[PDB]
Symmetry: D2
């Protein structure tokens, strides 16, 4: 029986330090000494194991990578210095001028901009579609289609996508890679490779680190493709090299990932249910609600329903600013997945970079408020909302 | 009068900490709290100053950036998580499928690969020329030429390039950006903008940090272009986001940059002179040599001659391995610019990724050794080469 | 109503950062700049707030201190660079040659040594008694008695001490300080001041940091006494100055203290129950057991029963070694309170420094094993003991 | 021939990391795993090498310790979490109630308080004398004398003490240890064991780290005494355990110690000479001046004259505040030995804790200004003083 996820966030990929250090040391070194020239030339040629230089690989970073690969059930993992770097190192390794990419239209704002404006200036063709509609992916495929990409639940509407149905369509022609951004679930909730996904990416800045003090990304997938991503996407094209110090903080944060995800999902269900019945609140989105579109798909793909909640007030945008400015426990900031509860307004903040018309076509409204529930006491979270919401009348 | 470089590497871009901290604290935070929504919306719309999220900006990272922009005399500076990321974020922001790039053919191995393989699969045209030769730049210019790129002294031959000349040729046509990789010199030795260069990049992993423990890059230039590089190159395309903890370490390392560069240059002159008169050595490339090509150019562009030394042994490849395997003080590893002296063999190590014929055309032979001298005692360094070299011969 | 402990370990003592940093920066600075001399002179004379020098105070260290003082319900808290430093700075500030100290005889090995050997060469009188036994405290009180000191549950037998009782006896004479080492419980399980305790110390190296990567101590109590401990115990006598980088890591670790203590206590109840019914096990000490001595006292003093479990194998010393050498998931090392489960053998390890007869008098036998349960899957933990224990027997 | 000091601040005590890390990794771990119980019990008994727990020892900390021991030419070194901790762990390991200590009266203010008030309440007898006067030490010895302690140059007057003469006197009776606080020189300037000193201490917060961001101390001396200091002074009495992260920063700072000390001493000579001829300045103290008392002893004991300068204005204390408040490059703060130049006023700042009468009996006046010169450009340092001093007229 496979080591459980609970035990594995601490003990997968055990390290062997020469002194028996309980916590493996931090390899804050840019470079590694060769014993002789032959060894150096063998490593550079890929003929001998061992380290060379921190943009190419680092033992502290590998420690984190093997733990994550295990938790995602993939052969390998490549760590980067930001979720965007993980995304970009992946798609810029795979694609070239002439290729085609299909993406869900509801994405993190910066990923949407990368696909709409950067890839298209490098000669890559992109389609933005609703990949939650059965059959939509297959309808937009062309012979040169190389990647189908999506986020579920989506940032920030929490739209659910049936991953297995998307993979069926994408893999109905040879040579297509399906990439899922699994940031909002984390590996404790979902393992996208279960459903046919080829590559899984994360902003490790969010739940995996969980402590709001590290910006970093992760790429999980087959070893041969990830070796290409490492030697092309990381080494030359993005240069998104994580600091070994930051990787060591993420391994530290990872050790409480299982207890954090459970506590945050439990609190989120209580908070979502509270929000739903407040008279000032118009609509609440939470994957665990039975009336949430794709709830049955969500239950199939997610072990817990997450700590992300998106909601709309009956007083709209102006209502959203008043509530948000008057919260006393919940913190006003972007990002998510930390131990403290955060909240923000996607149309003027995380998704302001996406043109309104594209926002709204994807279901992102100007009234939406996006909340990431931490591990505070749930009654005190509810009480902060009550006081803030009662003031709206 | 302008704050000298010797004071500025400690005191340029002074910070204001609320507690008066002598060393400004480490902002190891991914996100920043808004006082109210209007302020957050305003910061995202570029209408109000203040911070948002570390991929977009961070106060510790800005501290290092302002210090480097001052030292390079540029309006702005963008830090990244690797010298390659600085190069990539810069050229991927500027160019688009269909553009043309001119580069010196003698570059760091990974940059040459970035240019030869990655840029060309994205529809960019690239020519590798000898920009040190009068006329080559102007002859290769095309209507879609956007960038002229070079390193001087070059990695690893230490070829000197007349920057003023290259800039006048590149800028004889409108809309061309000249980009210089100033890593081997550091801002203490050269400020390439003095010669007309538009953008200056660095692998801050080398001399600037100077302690062999951080991988990071810097981009220095005008505010307009660097604001585009930050919003496109960093934010979307590379995601080469420097760690605030590493930026703080670079700032620490930067405070001794002036005394390290001086001490390393002084050592390097002694070591280069010793290598040049050793019977096992065919050739020594050092910018300080009076005979060497580009010496008057190197002298006009460099305040010090640097601590890089490249040399070729008369016994070739096999001789290089024997010497590098028997060195006891000098450290065998890639990288450079640290306090400890480092040495390596470019054809099988840093430049093994470049096809042999491109290596050979750029003067990278297989008898070539590259050395980065640190701040050890110069006599102990020369004695390590003496025992290593004598054994080769005897 | 008071902020709950579950919220307070993240949000008590909120900081105000000038940039709105969500995670307050690391003040890794030794010294602080004065705006003018008067201000500096005023801060040194205790007449003006603000910082001076990190041995004397530091904003990152104050952040952790205010968070812990809130969690323990004390006016103040002083952080140190080790649990021993917290103990030493406290007792070396209070006592002077000629004073008398009463301590429970069952203590952490190094504290017992500090007390038995160091304090006594400095002219302090020390008696080690069983403070869990009615009357022993009052019977040993002398006119010069300054301190009554204990740990509950005790390291490593987990003996429970009725704190309210000990305090009423100690405070039946004027001028006595009761000091409780609350490391095994953490502020999430017990607030010893609720029972009349004056000073609470911790090895923050254990549960509070909770990630096995920091050595640090805390002292919690009244502002008057802690101001003396900071100006004498820390500043001159121990020089146990915590690193701001480590304090920041402790603050990070503290944010999950509530969910870790709950998860570890829940696991520990399951693991203790399994050990108790295993035929190779003679005895299991766990505060949650309904039969065990001091259970109603433990229940009144502890919100949770903790994750420490101590047990004795019927095959004694040789059996303990075999079991500890064949465990595959539980980690053999000293320390405790981390996310990973740790185990060790007190008579040859943490308490080997205490003369055998003192160990034996305090109930530390050589068949005794101490376990600190972490947050792994409870069934995997029990399966590691099952294979280890079955092999012992078979 | 012994590795030079220049080379040794980088290369003494070379480490062997399993991956060949050029910069040895950071052992930020509180504890170490035993391979078996027997190994654990052997280490605890002092019968087997290897690590146990970070208050007892740590590989990153040992790296720093062996580099320092080499540079000081002592058998061993114990690192602590502050210079005061180094001092206290040493004297509290050696002494017991009934013992006697002789100290120079001109000391860092906090050391003076430790000796005057803490040791005396633990039954230790202390004499404060001018140890620069030939014969003074011997005159105050008693049968129970265990330690003779001093600082040279002294903080903050820069009084010079003939170490060899002090050691002769102290070692004229059996069982006496001479302890020198060598913070103001650093091991690049002086190695006190050359002159008979038994134990050398440092505030590594100053020059050795040299970057004003770490508080830490160092104890250098024979292995058997330092083993006692480690197992009693550090383990139980002070608990002054340095953070491995801070030890790794100090090894990093140490690598530029030789170039820093030379540049700071060179700048200091220029600054002291400038100050000396300014008409607003009454008196300048600098060990390199030929009229400095004990100049000949200083030349004998110091390879360079240091970067510390103490001076007095003809406008006294009020003059000192005006100059100090108007310096623009020099930084107003306590501490010293960093890359930036610092300045402070000892009577109201570092030595305010010492009663006036004791200050003045030791030569510390209310007019003294203490300056620690960094590596800025010397003309710009002089120019900051010129503008500040000219304003005093
Ligand atoms: C992280 N998104 C953030 C921050 C941008 C404002 C959020 O929505 O608040 C993110 C990323 C990019 O990862 P980073 O480069 O910021 O580490 C990638 N995927 C997802 C889903 C998100 O949310
Ligand atoms: C360091 N002294 C300082 C700081 C106190 C104000 C200075 O004079 O400004 C010092 C110490 C103590 O070392 P730390 O505990 O501060 O690391 C010990 N010896 C000397 C000579 C001094 O100066
Ligand atoms: C590669 C082996 C290391 C190194 N040169 C690096 C370097 C770069 C890239 O900087 P990063 O390694 O990504 O921080 C860019 N510019 C120059 C000139 C470099 O030398 C080598 O040892 O040569
Ligand atoms: C010693 C082997 C470690 C540990 N107990 C530590 C501890 C201390 C000391 O704290 P520090 O190790 O200096 O941070 C003080 N109080 C208690 C109760 C402790 O347990 C052990 O494994 O028992």
């Amino acid at each position: 029986e496979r080591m459980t996820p609970a035990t594995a966030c601490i003990h997968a990929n055990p390290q062997k330090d020469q002194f028996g250090a309980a916590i493996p040391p931090i390899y804050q070194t840019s470079t590694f000494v060769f014993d002789n020239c032959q060894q150096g030339g063998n490593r550079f040629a890929g003929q001998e194991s061992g380290y060379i230089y921190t943009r190419l690989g680092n033992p502290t970073v590998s420690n984190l990578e093997g733990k994550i690969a295990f938790l995602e059930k993939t052969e390998a993992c490549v760590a980067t210095s930001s979720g965007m770097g993980a995304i970009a190192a992946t798609v810029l390794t795979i694609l070239k001028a002439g290729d085609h990419l299909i993406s869900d239209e509801c994405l993190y704002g910066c990923t949407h901009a990368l696909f709409e404006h950067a890839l298209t200036k490098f000669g890559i063709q992109v389609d933005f579609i609703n990949t939650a509609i059965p059959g939509e992916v297959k309808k937009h495929m062309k012979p040169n289609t190389k990647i189908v990409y999506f986020e579920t639940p989506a940032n920030p509407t929490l739209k659910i996508i049936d991953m297995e149905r998307v993979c069926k369509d994408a893999h109905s022609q040879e040579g297509v890679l399906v990439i899922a951004d699994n940031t909002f679930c984390s590996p404790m909730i979902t393992n996208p490779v279960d459903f046919g996904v080829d590559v899984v990416v994360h902003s490790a800045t969010k739940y995996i680190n969980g402590h709001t003090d590290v910006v970093a990304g992760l790429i999980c997938g087959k070893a041969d493709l990830l070796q290409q991503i490492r030697m092309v996407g990381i080494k030359d094209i993005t240069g998104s090299v994580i600091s070994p110090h930051d990787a060591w903080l993420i391994t530290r944060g990872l050790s409480t990932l299982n207890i954090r995800m459970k506590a945050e999902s439990e609190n989120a269900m209580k908070v979502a249910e509270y929000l739903k019945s407040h008279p000032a609140v118009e609509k609440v989105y939470y994957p665990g609600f039975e009336d949430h579109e794709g709830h049955d798909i969500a239950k199939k793909q997610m072990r817990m329903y997450g700590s992300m909640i998106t909601f709309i007030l009956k007083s709209g945008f102006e209502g959203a600013k008043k509530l948000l400015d008057n919260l006393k426990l919940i913190t006003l900031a972007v990002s998510l997945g930390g131990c403290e509860s955060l909240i923000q307004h996607p149309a003027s903040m995380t998704h302001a970079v996406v043109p309104k018309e594209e926002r709204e076509a994807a279901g992102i409204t100007d009234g939406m408020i996006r909340l990431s529930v931490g591990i505070e006491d749930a009654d005190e979270l509810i009480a902060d909302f009550k006081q803030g919401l009662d003031a709206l009348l």
